[PDB]
Target: ATP-dependent Clp protease proteolytic subunit
Amino acid sequence: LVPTVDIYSRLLKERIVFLVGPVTDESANLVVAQLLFLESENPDKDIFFYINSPGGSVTAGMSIYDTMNFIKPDVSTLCLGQAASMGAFLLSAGEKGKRFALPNSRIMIHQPLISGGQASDIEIHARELLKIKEKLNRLMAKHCDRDLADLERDTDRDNFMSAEEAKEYGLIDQILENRAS
Amino acid sequence: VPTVIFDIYSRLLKERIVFLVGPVTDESANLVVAQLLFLESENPDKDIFFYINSPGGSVTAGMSIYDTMNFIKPDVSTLCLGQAASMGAFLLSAGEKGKRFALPNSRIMIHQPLISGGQASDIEIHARELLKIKEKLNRLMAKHCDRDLADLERDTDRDNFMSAEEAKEYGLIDQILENRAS
Amino acid sequence: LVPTVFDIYSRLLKERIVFLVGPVTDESANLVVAQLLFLESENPDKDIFFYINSPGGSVTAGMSIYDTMNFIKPDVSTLCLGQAASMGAFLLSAGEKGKRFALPNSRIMIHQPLISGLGGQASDIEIHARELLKIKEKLNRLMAKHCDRDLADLERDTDRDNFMSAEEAKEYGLIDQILENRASLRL
Amino acid sequence: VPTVAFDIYSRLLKERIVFLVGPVTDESANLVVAQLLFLESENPDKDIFFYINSPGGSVTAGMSIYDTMNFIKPDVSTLCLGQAASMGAFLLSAGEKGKRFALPNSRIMIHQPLISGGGQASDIEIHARELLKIKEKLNRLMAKHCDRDLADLERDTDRDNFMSAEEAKEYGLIDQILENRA
Amino acid sequence: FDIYSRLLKERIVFLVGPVTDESANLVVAQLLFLESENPDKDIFFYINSPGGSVTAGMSIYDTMNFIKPDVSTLCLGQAASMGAFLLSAGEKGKRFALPNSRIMIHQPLISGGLGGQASDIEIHARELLKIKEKLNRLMAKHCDRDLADLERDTDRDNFMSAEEAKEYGLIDQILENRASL
Amino acid sequence: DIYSRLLKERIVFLVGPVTDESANLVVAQLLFLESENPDKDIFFYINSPGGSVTAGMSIYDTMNFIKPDVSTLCLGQAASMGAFLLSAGEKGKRFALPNSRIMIHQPLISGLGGQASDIEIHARELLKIKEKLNRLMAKHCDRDLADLERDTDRDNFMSAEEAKEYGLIDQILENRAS
Amino acid sequence: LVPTVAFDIYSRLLKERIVFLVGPVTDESANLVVAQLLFLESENPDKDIFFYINSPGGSVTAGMSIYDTMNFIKPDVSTLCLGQAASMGAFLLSAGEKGKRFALPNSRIMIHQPLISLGGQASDIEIHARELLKIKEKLNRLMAKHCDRDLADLERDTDRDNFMSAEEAKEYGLIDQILENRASL
Amino acid sequence: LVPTVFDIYSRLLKERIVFLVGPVTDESANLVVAQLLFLESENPDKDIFFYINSPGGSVTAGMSIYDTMNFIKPDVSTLCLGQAASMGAFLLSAGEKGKRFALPNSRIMIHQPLISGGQASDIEIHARELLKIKEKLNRLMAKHCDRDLADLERDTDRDNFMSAEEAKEYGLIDQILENRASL
Amino acid sequence: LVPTVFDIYSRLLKERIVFLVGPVTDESANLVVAQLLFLESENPDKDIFFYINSPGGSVTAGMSIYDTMNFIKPDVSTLCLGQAASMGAFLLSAGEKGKRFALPNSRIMIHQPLISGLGGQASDIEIHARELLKIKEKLNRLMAKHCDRDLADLERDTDRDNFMSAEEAKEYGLIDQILENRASL
Amino acid sequence: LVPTVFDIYSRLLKERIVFLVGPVTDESANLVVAQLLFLESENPDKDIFFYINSPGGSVTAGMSIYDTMNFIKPDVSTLCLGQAASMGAFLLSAGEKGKRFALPNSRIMIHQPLISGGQASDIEIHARELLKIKEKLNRLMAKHCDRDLADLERDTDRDNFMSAEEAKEYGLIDQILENRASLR
Ligand SMILES: CCCCC[C@H](N)CC(=O)N[C@@H](CCCCC)CC(=O)NCC(=O)O
Ligand SMILES: CCCCC[C@H](N)CC(=O)N[C@@H](CCCCC)CC(=O)NCC(=O)O
Ligand SMILES: CCCCC[C@H](N)CC(=O)N[C@@H](CCCCC)CC(=O)NCC(=O)O
Ligand SMILES: CCCCC[C@H](N)CC(=O)N[C@@H](CCCCC)CC(=O)NCC(=O)O
Model:
């Protein structure tokens, strides 16, 4: 269904990587592979990471996040459509100064959720989920240059933000209307 | 259900026998509760004989039976036939001490609570409630069995099957009945 | 599936005992309503004993029970066995004050209204969301009255699932007394 | 279910005939138990006739019947009609010795316990050990019922073992084959 | 009373539809009841059945031979497989069919056979062949025929009219009305 | 294939429901064409019943972000988000074929569940979406917000001529001489 | 589904001697890893292989095919946990050449005893229960070896699901270093 | 997706490596047969390396592999990685004697045949065929393992799991290879 | 589900009316058989009124009714209300000659046997096909007798579904009279 | 799914090897037909090697292969590997006489036609046609096996399994090939 000249491989030659739809092990690892490839091609030029995602798996998302921070090139992020949950986490993780959103994109942040067995096992997994919640708040607070207490308050339930609101919050640096913004 | 000059379960209810058979649900538990209250109304001082063949089930449903057993005036004698596992074993052990029995090839099993959520805040709320249930049931079981809390904690960490003799050794029942001569 | 002695529930209905067991539906709630009206007709002056073991259910169905409990002349005493959660806890706390009881290992739980993500046009979602919040506010106000507490307490205490032991429910003001046996009644 | 002011099974319950038909479940087994207890209270001095046509089923449900047969005062005579397989054959062989019968074309089948339907290796170990304990107990009890050496039962239950009425009598599972009332 | 309980007062017992543990034991129960009511009067066993479980059918068969009353059989509609076996098992001289009844006999079949280790399949195949031999031997006795004839004539489905069943030895008479006796 | 060949003519199709996948494919093609030549018009042919609002906005913001003019053409139909994108084409370069149809309406949601607090949060966000889309649509159509609110309360079907009078498109093309 | 660069992106990274295990370990996904390991050894037995693991675990025998192949071939198999390495995934992570086992800073490890999602005669359940316990004992013995820890430690720490941060995994002995970025040699 | 270098499996085929992975079906077995014939055609004298990670499967499907292994001129060396169970273990044990290998943590399992309906006559026919297969497989397994048939009948009555070392002790394989210096 | 005036069908059985409604199955046919035997036991000389509204069904189930109607002493009068198709029309035509009726807007349909699902070996399919052809001929012969027609007539006229009005059914010989009300008799 | 060397099957087609694997369907049989015609076009005089591992399937699909085998100029040698059951056994037995082979542990099975409704008239028509099929298949098989028709009628009444040796004695194949030295 993807046109040829495929189109995503052609845009990859421009150092553009897309994350579209739910963050899964497969879709996240495909992003990781493209990031490693682009670094191999030129470790010094910026990579442009376009995000339209409702979120997904935390560990899948972390594999992208850690790869973004590991590789040498700056990873610029761009929100188009929406960046929610892990998508918003990855958006805010772009190189500071190079995190963008289009004017009508939507950001949403929230605490982790689950889609059990013995009480002992439920205890273990609840404790792990609470560590994830705590780690994500701390990393998000760092990304946004905000207090940990703010992130805890502001992710207790679904928190939708416009592009201007996400910029004020510290999740992105600039809103781009066109190539003059 | 066979009938007599009343169906067979109503007939045995005339002898103050109440059955708990199969999984403990809100409905099956409350039918037992209703029978216990009925028997107390009929005669508040005569023993009731509570026959249990159950794999367990809902904790709150079992607690409605348990608290009713302790609330009503008559002693509730318990008898394990077939099996008393999980909430079934809890109710077996809750019978009036001295009047908890098992038939010779009955089986007992005890274990910690099991279940089969959304936001982390809610999962935390329900995990903490589940752990309080786990502690409460161990504390109550230790009292029933005349044992230390630490013993019940180790012995319910995984499924713990017991023969009738072992359940007697454990303190969960008082006597094994082979016939009316024992 | 139900022993006769009249079956056992009809027999206890003669003792003026009514059960609410399991989820609260239109059918199970109206059956409670019918028993309440029947007992009032049998004797408008004698207490009724309403035994609740329920995880909750439909709010409008539970409200049909609530309004009937307050409408009829006899006092409706409530007793929690097993659990009274959500609409179950609301009905328990609605018993005649002084006559709300729980058994020692009962569990109470309160929370804000929950839905099974509405559907349709934004105008319709706005209408149903506004009604859902109104329901939430009304239930908090009624619960505040039942518990003899400030509205702000109930707003705080229902934001997420709030489990209570019998002791906690008594201290909250949701029940009056915990009964281990028939010697426990005081006051 | 025909009516004769009773249904047909309630009517034969007046002749002290109790049926076990189809799979043994908690529900079907406890119904048998209730009938055994009912008959005992009606007259503890008369035999009970326990007619078995069953492919087997739950071991613990079967033990609830077994232990009740041994507990109550009346002799429980057993009759195989059609078939008594697995727990059905166990109950058949558990009848009062001297009063265990089969009709001429009935068939018996015995075998070791099987499970139709998981977890951690620790939990699988616990349940496998319990299954072997059941297997050992059933071999010991079957050997006693049949007046045979334990090694005989271990060998002969390793896989499905079908027996004709005559073979079951020679094995010791029943006492006599009844062709008619003569 | 319902209609079947009322006809039970006339010592009429029906076997209708597949032979199962439940349907067969209900027949057994009625046969025992009727014997208890009067051990000397014939019982009239009306069969309209396509067959079913062999061991269930044997419980009826052995009960018919055990009780004191003669059990007269009547085929109405059809008596196939275990139904034809039971029809042929009524007291000799008192086995009847209505004129347009149909009988069918065949060797045993298993719905979904073969399941497990070769050892278990061997055990169950041998039991099935013993059942096959026993049914042929018993049927030959019912029909006053050779075991070899029953083996030949049941290898595949063998449909018989009432007159053919009478000639074969499965029934004694065809009754068009009460004067054909 | 046929679509890659027409992409060489700077023709991009949106056909069927707007999803994350179908919208981003459009985005990728728009970015590709800008990279091939940032100055030449792009021709965005729309035959769509609508779909996801955020997916549609990714197309919308990309149309406005890239340097080339994006001309739009309605063939068959442009409904809901499809009509939104049609009206977003470069002004003066928004077209419909003579028997195409337009339809506009307020946001819809399919289904889930949650606490009253969460439902309130999401209803408020849906109402903000509704107003933003009415405001943007009014700007595209050179009409008032109150007009768009009134005219999208329920499904509003428009012929090509009605859509031109409304301001959603500039011209109806029977052929290249229109 | 997969970008091209003449090669799909994964074939291209295989030219950098990078092999991925992503998602559940199955017979098919494990043998694909085995095939890439043998291919890279054939292409150059003198260069390290970089085995990137993001997996929740899966089949024990399929995982053992990877494990024994890693140990069989000449090249060092360096391992990297990205995302998570759970169960058989953590086993393979810890099996990388010692000194060359890595995790990214926010990856997570989880270890536990074998589980099954049994049926037949009691004899058969006994046979398979014994085989499952042998697997449990072997995996504890091998894991204790990878981690340079006492067997009793692994027996205690795998009784139930045991999650570890990257730092905890390093202290436990499952990995050697946590990699922040290319400050590397 | 299979990596490309040729795809990765074709590339390993050029080094005379053939895989049997997952259940033995008509389709998966014939693909192995086709590779064996191709490799014999490429060089009839050089060993073929048959890597087996399989839980077993169809008996006739396996026999087509077995008979091809015995038919072609090249020695077919076998290697168990992961597991060789049932028909998988049969083919593992069918490798050229002296060239049957296992990796150290692979496992073998052997057992009698199993199946996953009709007139008694037809069930009799199929039960007899199943018992002939059982006896034939026991006879061929006894030859592969250099053991008495009675040993094999006893040892396959139920699932019989073996470590690599037990499989070597049994006679099913020749050596366990930790690496190429294990030779 | 049935008004208990003791339900209405039990009440009409006191007037010696038996209904066949819907598909003829073993269970519904034997229920008819039992009522027929019951009414004969109550009084062997009084007419029985057999009201048929049926689309047909099982041939052997229908034959149990047919043979019982002919076996018992009472005349069995038949009445078609709504429709009598296939085995239903067969039973209608089987009523005591002179006492077979239809209501004015009743519908009759006759046709050859059909089978729902044959599946087995060619040998078994031959056996079952032959039995079906035997059934087809016997039913045509019996129907021809009821209608005072030839077997060849019935074979011709049942080859495909043959719908008949009440008047057409009377002309054919399937019924004796059409009753608008009792004055029709 | 299929290694390249050509994919592996196209590579073996270059050596005039054609496979029939798994159930015989319209699609699988016509692919065999297509290969047979292609090999004849490539060289009408050289043997074709038709390798069969099949449980059977559609009779009409199998007949399209059968008639194509007899129609083309090249001899079609057949080899049973694994099994040739029902239509598979029929096609195996249809190879050029003298050139029908089996591997030592192959299995052959033969039997009468099977069916996995409508008016009685329609059942009569299809029953008669099925019996015609049964008779025709027994007649052709008796010719292939150089045997009396009555033998085939007897020996296909129920599922009839044959070892390779039994199939050779039956006349279904000519030789059993242990390895490349087994040939005449
Ligand atoms: C744990 C208990 C679960 C259910 C009760 C839960 N506490 C609160 C709740 O569900 N309130 C709804 C009424 C309950 C009936 C089923 C949804 C309100 C309503 O009427 N909504 C209609 C609309 O506005 O569309
Ligand atoms: C056309 C239909 C007529 C069917 C009658 C058919 N001739 C005979 C028949 O049903 N025999 C089996 C009984 C059925 C039980 C299966 C659920 C015999 C049996 O139990 N053998 C041992 C075993 O099963 O293991
Ligand atoms: C849609 C119109 C329905 C009318 C039914 C249709 N006229 C005829 C019909 O039902 N024939 C079979 C029903 C008899 C049931 C006995 C088990 C007869 C039969 O037994 N044939 C041989 C075979 O079954 O093999
Ligand atoms: C183990 C069993 C497998 C072998 C099957 C067995 N040899 C015979 C077989 O399949 N015969 C049919 C042809 C196959 C068609 C498949 C869709 C007969 C037919 O063409 N009937 C049409 C009619 O008369 O209406």
